[PDB]
Amino acid sequence: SLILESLVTTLDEQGRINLAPLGPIVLPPQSPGGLPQFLLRPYEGSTTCDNLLASGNAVIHVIDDALLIAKTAIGKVDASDLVVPIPGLEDTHVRLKRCHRWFAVRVTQRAGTPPRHELTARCLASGLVDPFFGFNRAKHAVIEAAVAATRLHLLPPEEIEEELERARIAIEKTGGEPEREALQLIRRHVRESS
Amino acid sequence: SLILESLVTTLDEQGRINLAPLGPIVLPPQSPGGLPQFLLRPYEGSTTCDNLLASGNAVIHVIDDALLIAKTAIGKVDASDLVVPIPGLEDTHVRLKRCHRWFAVRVTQRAGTPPRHELTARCLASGLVDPFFGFNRAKHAVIEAAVAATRLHLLPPEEIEEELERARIAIEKTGGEPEREALQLIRRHVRESSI
Numbered sequence: 001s002l003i004l005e006s007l008v009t010t011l012d013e014q015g016r017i018n019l020a021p022l023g024p025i026v027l028p029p030q031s032p033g034g035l036p037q038f039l040l041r042p043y044e045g046s047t048t049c050d051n052l053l054a055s056g057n058a059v060i061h062v063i064d065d066a067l068l069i070a071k072t073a074i075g076k077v078d079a080s081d082l083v084v085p086i087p088g089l090e091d092t093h094v095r096l097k098r099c100h101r102w103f104a105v106r107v108t109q110r111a112g113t114p115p116r117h118e119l120t121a122r123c124l125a126s127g128l129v130d131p132f133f134g135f136n137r138a139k140h141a142v143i144e145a146a147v148a149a150t151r152l153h154l155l156p157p158e159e160i161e162e163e164l165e166r167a168r169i170a171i172e173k174t175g176g177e178p179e180r181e182a183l184q185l186i187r188r189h190v191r192e193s194s
Numbered sequence: 195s196l197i198l199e200s201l202v203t204t205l206d207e208q209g210r211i212n213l214a215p216l217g218p219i220v221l222p223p224q225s226p227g228g229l230p231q232f233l234l235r236p237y238e239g240s241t242t243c244d245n246l247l248a249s250g251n252a253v254i255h256v257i258d259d260a261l262l263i264a265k266t267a268i269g270k271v272d273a274s275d276l277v278v279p280i281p282g283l284e285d286t287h288v289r290l291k292r293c294h295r296w297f298a299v300r301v302t303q304r305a306g307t308p309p310r311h312e313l314t315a316r317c318l319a320s321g322l323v324d325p326f327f328g329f330n331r332a333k334h335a336v337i338e339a340a341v342a343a344t345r346l347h348l349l350p351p352e353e354i355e356e357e358l359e360r361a362r363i364a365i366e367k368t369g370g371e372p373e374r375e376a377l378q379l380i381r382r383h384v385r386e387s388s389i
Contacts, residue, residue: 003368005329023368062328069329101325131295132326133220134256135199135263140334147331174197174217 001025001039005143007069009059009083009094010051017094018047019079021069024060027120035123038105044115052107052119057092062101064133066142067178067185073150074189088125100132138175141167142182149186149193160190196220199337201262203253203277203288204245211288212241213273214266215340218254218315229317232299238309246313250301251286255293258326260333260340261372267340268383280319287318294326332369335361336376343380346387354384 008022027037038060042049052058063069071077083094086104095102109120133139148155148163155163164187171179202216219233232254236243246252257263265271277288280298287298299315306312327333335357342349342357358381365373 001368002370003330004327005331005368062326064329066329100328128325131322132256132258132328133196133198134294134326135258135260135333135337136196137199137334137337138196139329140331140337143329143331143334176196 004060004062005069007061007063007065007072007096007099008048009061009079009096010048010057011055011092011094012047012051013054015091017079017083018051019072019077019082019096020046020048021073022048022060024121030122035103035126037108037123038103038121040107040117040119040121041112042117042119044117049117053117055092056107057089058105058121059086059093059095060103060105061096061099062132063096063099064136064139065098065178066139066146067182070142070146070182070186073146074185086125086127093124095127095129097129099129101128102126136174136179138167138171138173138179141170142175142179142186145183145186149190154193157194164190195222198254198256199263201255201257201259201266201290201293202242203255203273203290204242204251205249205286205288206241206245207248211273211277212245213262213271213276213290214240214242215263216242216252216254221314229297229320231317232297232315234301234311234313234315235306236311236313238311243311246301247304247311249286252299252315253280253287253289254297254299255290256295256326257290257293258328258330258333259292259372260336261376264336264340264343264376264380267344268380283319291323293323295322296320330368330373332361332365332367332373335364336369336373336380339377339380343383346384351388358384 003023010018025039086093093104103123104125105121107119108122112118145163145167197217221231280287289296297317298319301313301315303314339357339361342354361377
């Protein structure tokens with residue numbers, strides 16, 4: 001399916017902000033030229049899933065920050081100082097100060113056989129912030145390594161080592177310090193998980 | 195600094211437009227928010243390299259179009275109705291109508307020993323156009339497959355096949371129609387080059 005590797009913000013019942021990775025499916029717009037809709041498949045028991053099921057709201061972000069995706073895939077990141085309330089939606093939706101694009105969404109349909117969730121969401125608002133760097137082989141390899149290192153069922157040692165090596169090479173060839181940092185964090189996570 | 199996987203337009207001596215992949219190094223500005231410089235390392239004997247050395251001009255594009263990268267990596271694409279001359283630079287630079295961002299550049303320094311050219315370029319003009327889709331694992335794997343398909347004379351068949359297989363997996367999971375088409379075109383190129 002057509003999937004964006006995003007960061008999502010949500011709020012709990014007390015307004016506490018959560019930031020986590022999500023891979024929403026991009027759905028057709030309601031009208032030609034219109035904003036995308038999204039199919040969200042949050043993981044049961046996650047803070048994102050709890051907050052979506054309670055509030056109906058989220059903000060999906062297009063980012064070129066592979067380091068932040070890696071950090072929030074591996075552990076919790078305090079996002080309280082990373083976000084600003086969205087105009088028109090200040091009590092329900094917050095966006096990252098640094099991103100390329102944000103989509104403030106609200107759930108329109110719900111389905112899924114427990115424990116799966118399928119939440120259709122439409123945009124209430126969207127905006128552009130920073131330019132996107134562009135394709136970068138190091139960022140891409142950080143994403144692959146982070147996905148590999150955080151799978152529900154552990155990959156065989158040879159497979160995870162292959163992803164880490166491909167990342168090392170791509171980062172040496174094309175990356176910067178945030179990508180170097182990301183790989184070190186992912187390597188730590190892999191070492192601590194075995 | 196980071197390397198951008200870009201599309202570059204250049205013009206030959208008769209004004210003919212070329213569109214091809216380039217991986218320039220992005221040199222940061224002195225001040226946050228300023229325009230960057232680029233280090234261009236074009237491939238000796240390529241149309242892009244010939245035009246850069248002759249004119250000193252190019253337009254570098256940030257694109258989310260992995261299909262177009264694949265097409266121009268594996269063969270010539272007629273870019274005549276993809277680009278338009280840039281006002282103020284209309285005799286020397288053309289830009290893609292569809293892109294996220296473009297930088298019209300001019301070479302300020304030539305270095306390197308042939309066949310490895312190293313050209314420093316500064317920005318004459320730039321702009322934003324379309325939003326960027328975002329990270330997509332299928333687009334990323336199409337880029338890696340396209341790089342491998344340009345290296346049939348440098349890599350064994352099993353290594354190129356493994357890049358094609360990683361693309362298949364990423365496209366099934368995350369891709370759309372352009373990425374599916376890109377992998378078909380790349381596989382066809384690999385098959386044709388083997389025979």
